[PDB]
Each structure stands twice: as structure tokens, then as C-alpha cells.
């Protein structure tokens, strides 16, 4: 519930490559890693419990279904295979409870979201995190990733990215736990990596952008995609993600550190911001925002025999739901019927999860967090009509359930 | 550019079952199919060019990544395998041009979207569509699907679905083409298909909801998920999709038809709404809306050597982007290096597309509609540094291009 501050850093994959190759005293790379140092120190000293991490996926985990604001709600994240195998880094833990609270708040404020679990984080995340945080066996903090669809136009306007951050601030502050949260905005600065214009940079615009983001961020909010692409290059226009992070910080921040280097394609820049707290009370109190974020499902627990599929339940039921979802694949479902045990022994299912499936325990799976539409698939594959499932839910014989209907179908 | 009207219809998979199992003379189902006939007849007579189709996917094509408003921008859609194999139905054609226009207007109005291509439509689409439209060889109209994330809470508020509809109305009207567009809201009405409460229905609420939706829809906009699940069953609360559709129509509509049947788990309902056009001119003219939708990329064409990855480009490059995306799979990329010609023959790639990859024609791929991030994967798989790709883009040798860099470095 306390925002300690925020940081901005480029996420170009070269940072990771330079790290993995130990170019720490290379004449080109030495002052660059030195640029990351104050951010690295601040993080080790401040010890945030969670980093809210704003990034974009580079057509790896997001392609055929490509969303604007994709909130990671899952228990943990591994490095994505980008075509060269997964980087050797430990998984980083997520925060389902914080992510759900944020989703509730952001939807109440009429932002439209996507929710995701299980997919890998590409270089947009693990390039800068691997240089910012020590990771021998695990990571020093949890993450809540926000993957932003900045690559397929139209994308949200600059002012929308900013307004998301403003609502995000209130969301994090109203979270009823005494934790410390840092916000990260990544990508940028100037660059262009496609077409005959590949290699464009604008150091002059970069410095201006940094200054304005720090000290007058509102003056950036009228910039169009054309403006940002003209000034910073096509891919450099991803800096709207910095705006989102900056919007989540206090209107006035202190700049603890800032650096800038351009050795090759991308302006590798870093900024560190110390949150100053609120200069005045927010328009709506923490207690009031909490009540408002809960109003949609207020009193839902008074509906008996009902198990609303909320984010917490989706996380709880994720392994078993993911498993049953695979029944839409011809080979998997053939195996489910002929050799279920061989399929179980290969899975990551708990013994209890296997047991629920083997027993065809319909109501138990619902209690546990399986969504009905996965059971529907399971029933179909096993030759079991939906009527059987409903009868089990109700504790009735098939005919006695059928009696509650107007016609037996 | 002309909204002729809209229909509301249940999407329960049981409609497809009865249809496929040929049940038009069965005593239970015959009257039900007769309930669909006024909507079927109106579609056949009115001949919309496109139906804007509002539905939800039932954890089939949308699961690990689950979005609120998922707009289908692609060229065609096939039935999804839902665990029983693909229903035997032909592909239905999309409308990428109208989809792109709609996206531009909606983002300008600050709705946050998802774009998708190539994935199957589950029963949410093909159940009612198969009874409403003839399809033995092909479909009579195009579709623009909008898959709504109604299953994983928090979901957008009722008023948000309605405001989406209001903005969608203007988006379709301002589309500079002389076409007829029908709007479909699907799902509902009362039902609950999970838990000890499974089997719940509420016919009185169903009728009142429909009457209010037809004649006073703004009286519904303060309904919470709890209100809607209490009155209509947990899954019955998806009727916010009906609201979105209703939001897209004239403030006054003529309700040509209403039917209602409850044989089993789901209140099977139909409504046909004739659009009454606009009583007064819109708050913002069509001309002004077109310009505002275009103002984010206004003047981007002045930027040389640049190829904005817009929806039209994402559609054009879809097959080749999708192919090169698969390089993230260990088995596919080993095959790419070891037997590319074999991989090509099994693919759906046109010869133009295969040739581009075969020649490692980097700039030609960018011109074609391949996004750089797919070429980055291809380069890496073949052991080529990004530096060679960039030099190829600039029409320079590696050494020549390196000179433009402050430091000539390796990666
Ligand atoms: O090859 C590079 O320097 C490079 C590759 C990327 O994918 C990227 O996003 C970037 O900013 C730079
Ligand atoms: O077995 C059923 O009647 C059934 C199954 C579904 O997946 C569904 O959405 C529905 O409204 C009814
Ligand atoms: Fe990026
Ligand atoms: Fe549905």
C-alpha cells in the first residue's frame, strides 16, 4: 500500500547479452553498467516487496491474440523461449492477490484489461531485471507484470497510458496490505529497428523527453504516435510506457539518478524516482475506493451453490484448468481416454487434482476451482452427457434432475 | 455505414446439437426453431453485407490469455475444435477493413482493445449462426466478431458494455463505405450451469429484462454482477453483451419479434430490433469522427523508410508472421534449419512468402508486412546478428553500417 518510488530503464536485448558475456569492464560497456548501479543500490536498500513492471512483449508470448493492457495474475513467470532456448534464470514470483486488487480498481475506473498466467516473459522483462536484481537462486522481490500492446496500431493514446498510471497509483495505495511497491517503466529511448530508416536516433529529443517526464510530464500528454515516431523513431514511440509508470508516481518526484548512453542501435537510458507522497488527500479515500472496487460483486456470497470465477479462483485452478483445456487437441484427448495414467505421470498435476479427474467428481472440481467449461469438455470426451454433470451438481438422480426441467432433452 | 438493426439470441450449444441432429419436426424443438424464423427471414430479405457479432468464447480459443473486448480483425473464421472435433461448417469471411476502422474509432474514444486472427469460433458464434443463416456451401454475409471476456471476474461494468455500444454505433456509421450492417448480441437469458444452484432460471426476470432492453435500456446500466447473477443465474449475467448490442442501435427501436422457450437449462430467447436511424444529427459529425480516428497516425506517411504495423498490415502479413513466430518452438526451428523446403511444402505459405524467407530477403519482408520481431527470431535461429539485418535494411555492407554507430559492437 506504499509506493516507494519508480524507475525507468531501456529494455533492449543487448543489455542481457552484455550481462551474459561479462562485459562489466569492457571499455564500451563499463560506464553503461555503471549507469544501472544507483538503481541496483536503491532496490537492494529499499527492498520493495513487489515491482509493478511495465513492459512490452516482442511478438513472443503475445501475437495471434494481442491486447492493450495485459495484467499478469499468475503465481510465477519463467523466461520465454525467443527462438534460442530459455535463458538460464530462476522463475520470478508473481502476486495474484495484489494483481486481483489492481484489476478490481482499474475496472471500476473503466479501463479494459486482459488477464494472463503461465506464459514466458521475454527480453522486455528479463533483460533489464537480470542486471538490476541478483538472481542466483531466486529473486529479491515479487512482480506484477503489465504487458502493453504498443506494437500493433491503433494503440492507446499517450493520455490513456498516463490515465492508467493515475488510476494505478490509487489502486496500489488502497491495497489493504502493509507492503512496499516499486513501479518500473521500461523500453526506449529513441531507436528504430526496421525499414530503410533503421538506425535513427535523437539524442536531443531523448534528453528533452527525460527532463519533461521527470519534471513536467503533463506537457507530453498531447503527443501523437506520429509525433513520437518522428522524434524518437518508430519503435522508440514505446516511451508511452514510461508515461504510464510516471503517472503512478507523486505529481512531484525527486530524481535520484539519471544516465544515458548510445553505443549502437538504442538509447540506453535510466531514471530513478523517489515518490514524495501525496501533497494533499486524494479525491476519494482508500476506504471508499476499496468499497467501490468491491461493489460489482458485493453481496455475491449470499448466492448459495455458486462459485464465482474470480482471478483468485482462476489462479487456484490454473494447473487443472490448463490440463482439461488441452482436451481440444485431438492427440491429447485420445491419450486422455486410452492412457490417462501416462498423461497424469507427465503432468504437473497434484495427486489431489489427478484424483478429482479419475473420480469424475463433478461438484468437487467446481468446489476446487475448475470452471464449468473445462468440465463440459471432459464430459464430452468421456461420452458423458451434460445432464449427468448437472444431476451430480444437485445430488440428484438423472431422472429426478430431468423432472426439474420443462422437457427432458 | 448503415445500421439496419440488430438481433438478440441465445448461444447455448444445444441449439447446434438439435440443428445437427436434424430436429425440425421434433415436438420439443419444432416450436423453438419456429421462434428463430422471423430473424432468419429478416436477415435473408435485408441482406446485410456484414454482421457485427457480439459473443463470448467458452474457454476454448480464449483461456491463458483472456481479454475484455477481443476484436477479430482477420480474413476468415473456422469452427473451433471444442473437444469433439470441428463442426462441419464452411469458413465465414471476416471484414479487416471495417474491423480496422472500428478499432480506430474505439481507441479514439478510449476503449482498450485486443486484436486477434486465425483462432476458431466456438459455439458462442456457430450455434445460433448455423440456424439463422444458410451455410451448406458458404455464408451470405461477412462477420466482424467481438469476443467479450464475461467469464473471468472482474469484468467490465454493465455501463461500460453499453458505452462500448454507443461508440460502436458512431464507428460503423462513419465507415466511408455504402454497406448494410446488422448487429448481433448473443448469449443468455437466465441459466446457471455450475454448482448446487445449477438449473436456476427466472422467467419473470427474463421477460422484464427484455422489455427494459427494448424500451428503456438506460434503466439497466446500474446493475451489478451480483444483481444479474441473483436474478438470472451466474452464467445468465452474460446478458451485458445484449446491452452492448442495444447500445449500438437507435435510442428508439421497433421490436419486430420476440420469442422465449425454456425446455432445459437455458432460457432460449430471440429479439429482432429494427433501427429507426437518427432523430437529430450526431454530437460529432461523420467527417469529424473520421479525422479524429486518423489523428494519431496523421502524417506518418511523411516518415520515409518506415512501415507502420497497422491492422491492415498485420492481416496482410498474418501467414508469414505466424509461420516465423513458430521458431520459438524447439521442434519447428530445428526443422527450419535442417529441412526448410519440407517445412514450406506442409505450410499454407504462398510462393511469394516462401521465396522471401528462402532468400533471407530482409527488406522485402519488411515491405511485405513481416514485423521486425519475427525477423529477429529468424536471424537468431540462422546464427545471423541483428547488425547484418539492419545493414540489409539500409542497403549497406556491415562495415559501412557500423560506421554510423558510435561504437561497432557485437551481439
Ligand atoms: O539489435 C538491437 O540492438 C535491438 C533489438 C531489439 O529487439 C530491440 O527492441 C532494440 O531496441 C534493439
Ligand atoms: O448443457 C447445457 O444446456 C449448456 C451448456 C453450456 O456450455 C451452456 O453455455 C449452456 O447455456 C447450456
Ligand atoms: Fe520494447
Ligand atoms: Fe456464453
Residue numbers in the entry:
A (entry chain A): 2 to 410
B (entry chain B): 2 to 412
What does the literature reporting this entry say, word for word?
The three catecholic compounds are degraded by three evolutionarily related type II extradiol dioxygenases–DesB, LigAB, and DesZ–in S. sp. SYK-6. On the other hand, DesB exhibits not only a strict substrate specificity but also high enzyme activity for gallate. While LigAB is an α2β2-type tetramer, DesB is a β2-type homo-dimer. In this study, we analyzed the mechanism of the substrate recognition of DesB on the basis of the crystal structures of reaction intermediates.
